[PDB]
Amino acid sequence: RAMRSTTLLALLALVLLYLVSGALVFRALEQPHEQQAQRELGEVREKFLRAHPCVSDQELGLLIKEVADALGGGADPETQSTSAWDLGSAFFFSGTIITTIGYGNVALRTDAGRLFCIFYALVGIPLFGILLAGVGDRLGSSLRHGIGHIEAIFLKWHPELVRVLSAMLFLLIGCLLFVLTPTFVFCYMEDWSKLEAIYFVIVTLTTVGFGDYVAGADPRQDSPAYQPLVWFWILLGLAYFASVLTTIGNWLRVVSRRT
Amino acid sequence: MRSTTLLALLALVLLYLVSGALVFRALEQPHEQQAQRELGEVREKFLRAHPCVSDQELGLLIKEVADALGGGADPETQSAWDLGSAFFFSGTIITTIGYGNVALRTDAGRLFCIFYALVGIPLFGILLAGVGDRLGSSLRHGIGHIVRVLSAMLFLLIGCLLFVLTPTFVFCYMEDWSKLEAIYFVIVTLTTVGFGDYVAGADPRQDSPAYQPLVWFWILLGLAYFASVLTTIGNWLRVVSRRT
Numbered sequence A: 001r002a003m004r005s006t007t008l009l010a011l012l013a014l015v016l017l018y019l020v021s022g023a024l025v026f027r028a029l030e031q032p033h034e035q036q037a038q039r040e041l042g043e044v045r046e047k048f049l050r051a052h053p054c055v056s057d058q059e060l061g062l063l064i065k066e067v068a069d070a071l072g073g074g075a076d077p078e079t080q081s082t083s084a085w086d087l088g089s090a091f092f093f094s095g096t097i098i099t100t101i102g103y104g105n106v107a108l109r110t111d112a113g114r115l116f117c118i119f120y121a122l123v124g125i126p127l128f129g130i131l132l133a134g135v136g137d138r139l140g141s142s143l144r145h146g147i148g149h150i151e152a153i154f155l156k157w158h159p160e161l162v163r164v165l166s167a168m169l170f171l172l173i174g175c176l177l178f179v180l181t182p183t184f185v186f187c188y189m190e191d192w193s194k195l196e197a198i199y200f201v202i203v204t205l206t207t208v209g210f211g212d213y214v215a216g217a218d219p220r221q222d223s224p225a226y227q228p229l230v231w232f233w234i235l236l237g238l239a240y241f242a243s244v245l246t247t248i249g250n251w252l253r254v255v256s257r258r259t
Numbered sequence B: 001m002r003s004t005t006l007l008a009l010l011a012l013v014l015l016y017l018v019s020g021a022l023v024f025r026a027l028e029q030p031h032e033q034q035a036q037r038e039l040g041e042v043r044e045k046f047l048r049a050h051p052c053v054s055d056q057e058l059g060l061l062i063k064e065v066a067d068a069l070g071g072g073a074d075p076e077t078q079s080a081w082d083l084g085s086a087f088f089f090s091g092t093i094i095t096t097i098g099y100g101n102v103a104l105r106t107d108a109g110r111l112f113c114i115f116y117a118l119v120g121i122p123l124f125g126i127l128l129a130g131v132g133d134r135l136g137s138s139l140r141h142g143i144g145h146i147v148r149v150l151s152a153m154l155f156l157l158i159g160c161l162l163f164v165l166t167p168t169f170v171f172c173y174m175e176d177w178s179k180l181e182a183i184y185f186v187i188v189t190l191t192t193v194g195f196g197d198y199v200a201g202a203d204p205r206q207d208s209p210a211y212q213p214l215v216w217f218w219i220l221l222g223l224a225y226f227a228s229v230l231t232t233i234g235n236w237l238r239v240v241s242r243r244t
């Protein structure tokens, strides 16, 4: 009842190469209609100048929308009024699909992206499910093996005791690693509050993906490869969680089956 | 897999949506009307001033409006976000669909939602099973009444006619969407991606407010079916191929 080591490594790459494949289908499929609401506002701000519309409620009523729908499109900080969606964005995006988060912070506009998507999902999501298995297992165990050195020493002092300790320790060594480090990190890179980053993390991992926050979707960001990294994280932490989530489902079932 | 014990969760879980929606509407509604009130003013303060030919005030006019927008303001023109929308919202949470088309702003209600998930979503997985079974058991009393892999092709295409392609045709006549959009919507919905680009019950222009918890209750049976099918496939495609 186990998956083979070098088996998943072939799978995983089979997936990256599926994702990288998806990012390409999208890259040169949505590149053109990319809104880029930052340069579209200037054409709306200045257009209000060369025309100097004045003393009208009707001409204002719509502005609010023209600034709302424009703002909503990830518009500039509206105080500047003075390039994005490449692979790191397209790849990351594709990933938010199979992972089923779907941040959708950047809507799809090209009808092909919708049809292709429909298929990229129905074919992507399932493919992922396995990756988690390969990871949750081949990885999840590695760490259980690591802690071995800890419990090997605890035994030199006294069994049934070390059992519970490793169980609680592992959750933490896993938590502190997939909750805390990431939450703390998202603050020092996206200038969010502690809460927001933990709020984010939680929505990321629960894969609710509200979309209100997304680790790498600011056109003003500088580090390009950073997005896929946070993705390589989502994978890891998403997989770990699943393992710990099922085990408890049993520990909670073995005690619930006697009803 | 108790068929009368899960019926209780349909009341518990269903309450978890209402019993939870109450907080969201009581945590966000205040700052839902404030961004409106604070817009009304900023809107006419400028309008009634009838300024002219300037930029000094437009840089502000813009930033003045965004503030109101960030807190969730009206689109234009010059009512939204109550329990009805919260219920739906709360539900998009457990379904982990999270359309987010409508966001959380209250820094306080945000944390409330952080926990509502951890402990709220785990129950849904149970109901989709409790329902993924009753719909999985309905394969006999349904298909039996009318060689081997031949009776599988049918069940697959049974649900596509019931859950997949049924609502899509319905959504074009309810929200004017194209053929595709409905499909694209349903898939992103069912696969629970929840892109949020599109959404069934949130359009501002609706006149039937009763049919929404029905479109939502549909999501239940929807994912439940999609679960019932993955439940068999996931346990069949594995055993046959072990040594393969």
Ligand SMILES: [K+]
Residues within 6 Å of the ligand: A100, A101, A102, A207, A208, A209, A210, B096, B097, B098, B192, B193, B194
């Ligand atoms: K989602």
Ligand SMILES: [K+]
Residues within 6 Å of the ligand: A104, A105, A211, B100, B101, B196
């Ligand atoms: K959005």
Ligand SMILES: [K+]
Residues within 6 Å of the ligand: A101, A102, A103, A104, A208, A209, A210, A211, B097, B098, B099, B100, B193, B194, B195, B196
């Ligand atoms: K989502």
Ligand SMILES: [K+]
Residues within 6 Å of the ligand: A102, A103, A104, A105, A209, A210, A211, B098, B099, B100, B101, B194, B195, B196
């Ligand atoms: K979303």
Ligand SMILES: [K+]
Residues within 6 Å of the ligand: A099, A100, A101, A206, A207, A208, B095, B096, B097, B191, B192, B193
């Ligand atoms: K999801």
